[PDB]
């Protein structure tokens, strides 16, 4: 009945974790250039709880911290702390054989935590509201009906190569089934749903007046539409993998059990009834993953509870209150392609589906659009070349394959029967299981990713040895530093606010040394010069740390050198105190030995280039200014009016 | 005139930090007994929005944490970290001669932080609304005109001995602060901002008209009306002390300076122009206390002289004031234990160690729980005497400290070794370092009194848990999942007393015998748990019994401790361990608490977080006697524990 037409820079299809992270990242570029139009749609109402996830891993939290979202999430989430392993003994009774750390010591300053997905979303929704000044909001219930891509306009910055036809649904079309169960349940969301049903349930019924069918001309489209992604199926992107018939059930409940480790993360392998994974949650809840075509109507809590009782034998297990529940089969799926012309992208469950044994979904799916987001943002504001969009798929698809590989094995070890004795070859070795879990915990933290050389990751021009624990292509790891301004001891990763800027981390080394200070001054003379990356890439009369943020971490105690002993304003910006940090001893903490943790020489230092994303992309010395120019030349687009050579007088000397 | 009459349990005059903290603590007793009527009024139309008090010290933050208000505050406040001391050369040039820590290492897990008073107020206002489920609201602008006290009714529980006559003020009769609420650029609004903005409109409680005069019959009145207190003046309590001729100015600004330590806390003694104290704040602001010889320009001119030769300009100005160096304190804090005073109303001093808001909230944090327990029929009225016994001596020590410190800060630095009129910079440094212990608020030691029992304690069983001092937090490992945490986070301030059971080496058969015997006491018909928890109420709801043992959690289970006495049914915030964990070494917390690792001890902590009794597992008679002098037995006691051990099938 109503036919409409409009244009937009980005269309995000799906407002789950992936889609919302995409919106949150894009919001920053929308605030810098308010003409940009970024829309995000969902086809579901908010009346049926639409979520299922609860775990946030180490690198997700470091990233959320850089988006200003971690402290609010951390004030409510639960740190499970320990993984207690339970398996049958001589007589087949389950007992605790071991305990391993839920997060690996030293891997990150943030530990994995768990929290209701709806609270995670709310926090991301508030941030989007703030960063976009309420301008970007989820539109629902809306659903794409057609997608037409003109591959001949793909490299044209003025074109709108993707035409999306959206249908405005009815409240009833947008409401998912609940299969007759009283308890709020996300068996709709569940992966037992079929993509057929996913499309069939939100379909314009028969007595059918689409309320409105909108023709949206888009520069870019991001498909964050889940497991059965319609965006993926319409691009023709196959998905390799096959679903087992191992079936598990999920209970979010306030338990009433004598199980000694009911409040700890646990793995329970029973002799013959299946496994359980306990995920202790906030506010007295505990999540239970209980091992059990399937008729979802008959899939009740009761069936799941009866099976959990068998697995817990001889400990007791009862539910005091049940908030939600689901079911899922064990299966792994991945696509080979994440992009169609670097115009239509898929992210999140749309690209990779797997079991929840290591709670990786929401994590990986937000990290996908955290990666894509800054690349799209720089492209959209005219700051970076379109070729950086190829790095999305280059970096994230290999990661999804490694994710599916890890889940493939971990889910099967988790779902198999434990070996009775050593001769029982077709049982699961509990020692192999422990080994897989410990090894899986490094991968599952999200902190071990190493991106292969690409347009925004330059290994070839790097002297890696100058910063040995700052491996190009890996996340720039936070380490404690002492802010020079007042002596505040802090995690340096707090300083890397994600807002589209690249960083140049200047490890000034032993700045009191006359020879080292000569190198530092020469580097700052480069920075101040007419054609440095600072002068070239920061728009005329804009702040010189507004595109490329130049931060100095030195090796001296702050009693031995002043901030004004560093070049001003190249390294010591006028009346600004978030630029000079020190690897030294402080009132409440010992010398953190951060240069050493970063693998950098304490006397000579190094220069490390970090992406907007927080991933190290270049490692050189203070003399490697040509490698810095070349790195930025292949990525950034020069503003129409450049800042040019630094013309301000040293503010620390100047009399007023 | 419209006239009205009503009754209330507590009337709080003054909605500054003191009053708000009183409302916040009383809110909990109101939630437990919703008939209680607690009101809080104020003569200013709106809350403060800028400047004024800005310092939060260690013990305040520990307490705020126990009230669920520290993390919100910490997410915005600034930790000044260092104090840089500057004094003149031989040629009279100011230079940095030293740096000392802003918070003393090891003194607390919280460091002093700074954040203006409007933010604090916002936060205690939101807490109040949440705990009291919006029932307790600041009524403003209203002002008392008369107070009549009937001392012959002081000990009658049913009486309303204090009659307050209140007047509803009009928008234009209330005096607004010059640096008021500032609308936020943009369309986006968080709730702080939204709350801030409605708070910024004049607005009598509903139906009330400016001019309306209300006669309020009160059981209790708390005057938190500030340095010029109308309540203290009406009570006739003399503000004893002297006001010097030293005058200082204050600037809350975004500075434009080449001073190297502009973002650090600093003390600057200039040769002949006076002193400066720099207090580096949140969001690029810096607070400057500038000694004068009025408007902001006069204060800037003087700061330029003191900073010579460094530059000093103001990029933006958020607030400003001037005051005189002076100290004043009352001898009494209470009239019949019916009308109390708290905060600046009892003690005023210079802001050199930003003690005002800190001490004032600690006053009503102390008074509050005592009033709360009396009002809910849980404690006897005699505990109210301990407010004044504890807090007035502290106010006297505060004025004594400020008396000396403000004078050292406002004097001209000694040129020579012979310059005796001048201030010795070495004496100054000593005073500051020694002042920092006091100013943390963590060294208070209350004298023996009804709620603090030193005589019946065996202090040696817990040597760093000195009766009368705050029960210091120490890292522990929650046994349920192995979470490493500060144990003080567990002492939620909500009116409960704690019994901290240091179970010691629980795997020892002899030690477990003592533990079980203690738990048999707890479960017995006449224990403090059975006597003081109402029939069918949770047995940790009045006296909260927490167990901290010395074993690793791989060596003993939670269900090896008596259930439900020490291991409550399906509840996992009771058993903690002094052990090694995944991310931290063994904290050595028993040793930090000065408690024997094998034998343990039993420490009783007040609702307030102050230790009040130290004994051993056999000292059950001392525990009974301690609680019998304080608590009132409910009409229907819980009696002996009758639940089966829930851990056994
Ligand atoms: C039981 C269970 C527990 C899990 N636990 C965890 C855990 O703790 N940690 C973790 O990281 N992961 C977990 N996962 C995985 C995680 O839930 C998903 O991987 C994650 O939600 C993927 O997010 P997404 O944004 O890509 O897609 P989804 O979360 O599926 O969201 C897609 C969104 O797009 C919408 N949509 C779909 N089709 C259309 C359309 N055609 N048009 C418009 N909108 C559309 C939706 O209605 C939906 O809001 C768990 C999964 C399950 C099954
Ligand atoms: C103008 C000013 C400037 C200050 N500057 C500083 C500074 O630079 N540094 C520093 O550390 N501290 C400063 N303080 C001191 C500090 O703010 C207090 O120590 C702290 O707020 C604790 O005080 P209080 O709660 O007891 O009283 P206050 O904070 O004074 O609050 C008293 C409240 O009661 C009200 N009131 C007063 N009379 C009546 C009445 N008759 N009826 C009803 N309500 C009434 C007021 O409107 C006020 O809201 C300043 C205080 C003032 C008032």
- CATH number where A327 lies: 3.30.9.10
Q: Are B79 and B112 in contact (CB under 8 A)?
A: yes
Q: Are B26 and B372 in contact (CB under 8 A)?
A: yes
The residues facing A290 across adjacent strands are A249, A276
Is residue A289 annotated as a catalytic residue, yes or no? yes
Q: Is A597 exposed, middle or buried (0-12, 13-18, 19+ CB in 10 A)?
A: middle
The residues facing A464 across adjacent strands are none
Q: Are B102 and B83 in contact (CB under 8 A)?
A: yes
Cα A137 to Cα A11, A19, A23, A229, B381, distances in angstroms: 12, 12, 9, 21, 57
Residue nearest to atom 12 of ligand 2 (CA): B53
Q: Annotation-wise, does B495 bind a ligand?
A: no
Instruction: Name the one residue in this structure whose structure tokens are 């999942």.
Output: B481
Domain membership flag for residue B49 = yes
Q: What angle do CA B339, B344, B350 make, to 5 degrees?
A: 160
Q: What angle do CA A7, A8, A9 make, to 5 degrees?
A: 140
CB contact residues (below 8 A), chain A span 186-225, against chain B: none
CATH number at residue B141: 3.50.50.60
What's the CA dihedral at A34, A39, A45, A50 to 10 degrees? -100
- Residue A484 makes CB contacts below 8 A (sequence gap 6+) with A558, A563, A577, A580, A581, A582
Q: Is there a single domain that holds both residue A229 and residue A301?
A: no
Tell me the structure's resolution in angstroms, rounded to a single decimal.
2.4
Joined tokens for residue B15: 């909605």
Burial B209-236 (b: 16+ CB within 10 A, else e): eeebebebebbbbbbbbbbebbbbebbe
Q: What angle do CA B559, B565, B566 make, to 5 degrees?
A: 55
Relative orientation angle of helices B356-375 and B385-410, to the nearest 10 degrees: 180
Instruction: Name the one residue in this structure whose structure tokens are 């040509």.
Output: A626
Which of A80, A256, A587 is facing B105, going by the closest CB pair?
A: A587
The rounded distance, in Å, linking the Cα atoms of A257 and A403 is 34
The rounded distance, in Å, linking the Cα atoms of B560 and B566 is 10
- Residue B637 makes CB contacts below 8 A (sequence gap 6+) with B530, B531, B532, B533, B534, B535
Residue nearest to atom 37 of ligand 1 (CA): A225
Joined tokens for residue B291: 């000694």
The H or E element spanning position A524 is helix A514-528
Select from B344, B340, B347, B393 the least CA-distant residue to B367.
B340
Q: Is there a single domain that holds both residue B130 and residue B44?
A: yes
Instruction: Indicate yes or no: CB of B315 within 8 angstroms of CB of A75.
Output: no
Relative orientation angle of helices B117-131 and B17-32, to the nearest 10 degrees: 10
The rounded distance, in Å, linking the Cα atoms of B4 and B167 is 10
Cα A186 to Cα A243, A252, A287, distances in angstroms: 20, 11, 14
The rounded distance, in Å, linking the Cα atoms of A116 and A119 is 6
Q: Is B151 exposed, middle or buried (0-12, 13-18, 19+ CB in 10 A)?
A: exposed
DSSP string computed for A260-295: TTTTSEEEEE-SSS-EEEEEE-STT-EEEEEE----
Domain membership flag for residue B526 = yes
Domain membership flag for residue A185 = yes
Q: Name the experiment that determined this structure.
A: X-ray
The rounded distance, in Å, linking the Cα atoms of A85 and A103 is 15
Instruction: Indicate yes or no: CB of B81 within 8 angstroms of CB of A486.
Output: yes
Nearest chain B Cα to A318, which residue?
B570
Q: Are A58 and A103 in contact (CB under 8 A)?
A: yes
The rounded distance, in Å, linking the Cα atoms of B357 and B377 is 30
Select from B291, B319, B81, B58 the least CA-distant residue to B180.
B319
List A54, A252, A499, A583, catalytic entry: A54
**Cα–chain-centroid distance for residue A449?**
12
**Cα–chain-centroid distance for residue B609?**
11
Q: What angle do CA A569, A573, A576 make, to 5 degrees?
A: 160
Domain membership flag for residue B514 = yes
Burial B332-355 (b: 16+ CB within 10 A, else e): ebbbbbbbbbbbbbbbbbbbbbbb
Joined tokens for residue A106: 């030293």
Q: Annotation-wise, does B357 bind a ligand?
A: yes
Q: Is there a single domain that holds both residue B415 and residue B543?
A: no
Q: Residue A141: is the preceding peptide bond cis (ω within 30°)? A: yes
- Residue A648 makes CB contacts below 8 A (sequence gap 6+) with A569, A574
Q: What angle do CA A18, A609, A376 make, to 5 degrees?
A: 30
Joined tokens for residue A178: 């609940």
Q: Is there a single domain that holds both residue B405 and residue B467?
A: no
Domain membership flag for residue B380 = no
The rounded distance, in Å, linking the Cα atoms of B468 and B604 is 11
Q: Are A445 and A112 in contact (CB under 8 A)?
A: yes
- Determine if ligand 1 sits within 6 Å of the CB of residue A224: yes
Select from B222, B521, B438, B170 the least CA-distant residue to B346.
B222
CATH number at residue A645: 3.40.30.20
Q: Is A632 exposed, middle or buried (0-12, 13-18, 19+ CB in 10 A)?
A: buried
- Determine if ligand 1 sits within 6 Å of the CB of residue A117: no
List B54, B261, B544, B616, catalytic entry: B54
Report the number of distinct structural domains present in chain A.
3
Among left, alpha and beta (phi > 0; psi -120 to 50; other), residue B290 is beta
Joined tokens for residue A259: 């199980």
Domain membership flag for residue A47 = yes
Strands (E), A62-160: 82-88, 94-101, 113-114, 138-139, 142-149
Q: Is there a single domain that holds both residue A65 and residue A210?
A: yes
Q: Is there a single domain that holds both residue B536 and residue B600?
A: yes
Pocket of ligand 2 from Cβ distances under 6 Å: B 13-18, 41-44, 52-53, 55, 117, 143-144, 224-227, 230, 250, 321, 343-345, 351, 354, 356-357, 360
Joined tokens for residue B121: 């107020």
Nearest chain A Cα to B278, which residue?
A486
Q: Are A73 and A120 in contact (CB under 8 A)?
A: yes
Cβ of B238: how many Cβ atoms within 10 Å?
12
Question: What backbone torsions phi and psi does residue A387 show, to the nearest 5 degrees?
Answer: -60, -25
Q: Annotation-wise, does B52 bind a ligand?
A: yes
Q: Is there a single domain that holds both residue B51 and residue B181?
A: yes
Select from B140, B139, B341 the least CA-distant residue to B222.
B341
Among left, alpha and beta (phi > 0; psi -120 to 50; other), residue B336 is left
**Which residues of B are less than 8 Å from A256 in CB distance?**
570
The ligand whose atoms approach the alpha carbon of A41 most closely is 1
Number of H helices, E strands in chain B: 14, 25
Q: Is there a single domain that holds both residue B125 and residue B222?
A: yes
Which of A134, A486, A651 is facing B264, going by the closest CB pair?
A: A486
Domain membership flag for residue B550 = yes
The H or E element spanning position B348 is strand B347-348
**Which residues of A are less than 8 Å from B481 in CB distance?**
80-82, 261, 263-265, 280
Joined tokens for residue A1: 């009945």
Q: Is there a single domain that holds both residue B25 and residue B94?
A: no
DSSP string computed for B446-491: PPSBTTB-STT--GGGBTTS-TTSB----EEEETTT--EEEGGGG-
Domain final residue pick, A404, A420, A444: A444
Label the pairing between strands A212-223 and A275-280.
unpaired
Q: Quote the ligand 2 centre to B181 CA distance (angstroms).
A: 17
Task: Tell me whether A76 touches chain B (CB under 8 Å).
Answer: no
Q: Is there a single domain that holds both residue A285 and residue A419?
A: yes
The rounded distance, in Å, linking the Cα atoms of B125 and A600 is 49
The rounded distance, in Å, linking the Cα atoms of B427 and B588 is 36
Q: Is there a single domain that holds both residue B92 and residue B73?
A: no
Select from B513, B480, B2 the least CA-distant residue to B209.
B2
Q: Are B56 and B112 in contact (CB under 8 A)?
A: yes
Nearest chain B Cα to A486, which residue?
B264
Domain membership flag for residue A385 = no
DSSP category for residue B549: E
| Domain assignment of residue A20, given as a range | 1-79+110-237+335-380
Reduced to 3 states, what is the DSSP secondary structure of residue A425? coil
Task: Tell me whether A587 touches chain B (CB under 8 Å).
Answer: yes
Q: Is there a single domain that holds both residue A224 and residue A246?
A: no
Cβ of B147: how many Cβ atoms within 10 Å?
20
Instruction: Name the one residue in this structure whose structure tokens are 């799906």.
Output: A14
Output helix, strand, coil percentages for chain A, rounded to the nearest 5. 30, 25, 45
Instruction: Indicate yes or no: CB of A587 within 8 angstroms of CB of B256.
Output: no
The rounded distance, in Å, linking the Cα atoms of B23 and A514 is 61
Task: Tell me whether A256 touches chain B (CB under 8 Å).
Answer: yes
Q: Are B379 and B447 in contact (CB under 8 A)?
A: no
Label the pairing between strands B82-88 and B94-101.
antiparallel
DSSP string computed for A30-66: HHHSTT--EEEE-SS-SSS------EE-HHHHHHHHH
The rounded distance, in Å, linking the Cα atoms of A596 and A312 is 47
């Amino acid at each position: 009945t109503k036919y409409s037409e409009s244009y937009c820079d980005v269309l995000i299809v799906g407002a789950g974790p992936a889609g919302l992270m995409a919106a949150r990242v894009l919001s920053e570029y929308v605030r810098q250039k308010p003409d940009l139009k970024v829309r995000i749609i969902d086809k579901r109402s908010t009346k049926v709880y639409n979520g299922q996830a609860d775990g946030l891993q180490c690198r997700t939290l470091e990233s959320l911290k850089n988006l200003g979202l971690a402290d609010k999430i951390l004030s409510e989430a639960n740190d499970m702390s320990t993984i207690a392993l339970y398996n049958p003994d001589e007589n087949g009774h389950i007992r605790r054989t071991d305990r391993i750390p839920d997060t690996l010591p030293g891997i990150s300053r943030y530990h994995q935590v768990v929290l209701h997905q709806g609270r995670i979303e709310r926090h991301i929704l508030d941030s989007i509201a703030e960063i976009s000044d309420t301008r970007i909001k989820v539109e629902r219930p809306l659903i794409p009906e057609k997608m037409e891509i003109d591959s001949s306009k793909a490299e044209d910055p003025e074109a709108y190569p993707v035409t999306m036809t959206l249908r405005y649904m009815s409240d009833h079309e947008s409401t998912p089934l609940q299969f007759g169960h009283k308890t709020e349940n996300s068996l709709f969301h569940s992966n037992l749903q079929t993509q057929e049903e996913e499309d069939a349930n939100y379909r314009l019924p028969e007595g059918k007046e689409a309320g409105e069918i909108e023709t949206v001309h888009c520069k870019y489209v991001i498909g964050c539409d889940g497991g059965h992604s319609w965006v993926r199926r319409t691009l023709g992107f196959e998905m390799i993998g096959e679903q087992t018939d191992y079936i598990w059930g999920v209970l979010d409940a306030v338990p009433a059990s004598n199980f000694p480790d009911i409040r700890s993360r646990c793995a329970i392998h029973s002799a013959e009834s299946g496994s359980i994974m306990i995920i202790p949650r906030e506010n007295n809840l505990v999540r239970f993953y209980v091992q059990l075509r399937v008729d979802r109507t008959k899939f009740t809590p009761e069936v799941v509870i009866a099976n959990a009782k068998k697995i817990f034998h001889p400990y007791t297990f009862d539910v005091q209150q049940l908030d939600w529940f689901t079911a899922y089969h064990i299966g792994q799926r991945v696509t080979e392609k994440f992009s169609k012309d670097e115009r239509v992208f898929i992210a999140g469950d749309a690209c990779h589906t797997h079991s929840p044994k290591a709670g990786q979904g929401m994590n990986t799916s937000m990290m996908d659009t955290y990666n894509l987001g800054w690349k799209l943002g720089l492209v959209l504001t005219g700051r970076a070349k379109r070729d950086i969009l190829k790095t999305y798929e280059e970096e994230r698809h290999a990661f999804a394959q490694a994710l599916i590989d890890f889940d493939h094995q971990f889910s099967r070890l988790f779902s198999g029967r434990p070996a009775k004795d050593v001769a029982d070859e077709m049982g699961v070795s509990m020692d192999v299981f422990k080994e897989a879990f410990v090894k899986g915990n490094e991968f599952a933290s999200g902190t071990a990713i190493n991106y292969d050389e690409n347009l925004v990751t330059d290994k070839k021009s790097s002297k890696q040895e100058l910063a040995k624990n700052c491996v190009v292509g890996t996340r720039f790891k936070s380490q404690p530093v002492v802010r020079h301004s007042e002596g505040l001891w802090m995690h340096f990763g707090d300083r890397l606010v994600t807002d589209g800027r690249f960083r140049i981390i200047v490890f000034a080394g032993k700045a009191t040394d006359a020879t080292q200070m000569s190198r530092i001054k020469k580097f700052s003379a480069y920075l101040d010069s007419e054609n440095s990356v600072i002068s070239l890439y920061t728009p005329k009369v804009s702040d010189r740390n507004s595109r490329i943020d130049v931060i100095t971490i030195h090796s001296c105690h702050r009693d031995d050198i002043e901030m004004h002993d560093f070049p001003a304003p190249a390294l010591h910006p006028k009346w600004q105190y978030d630029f000079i940090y020190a690897d030294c001893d402080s009132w409440h903490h010992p010398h953190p030995k951060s240069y050493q943790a970063w693998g950098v020489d304490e006397t000579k230092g190094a220069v490390v280039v970090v992406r907007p994303d927080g991933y190290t992309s270049l490692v050189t010395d203070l003399e490697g200014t040509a490698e810095i120019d070349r790195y930025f030349s292949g990525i950034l687009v020069e503003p129409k009016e450049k800042s040019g050579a630094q013309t301000e007088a040293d503010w620390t000397k100047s009399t007023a």
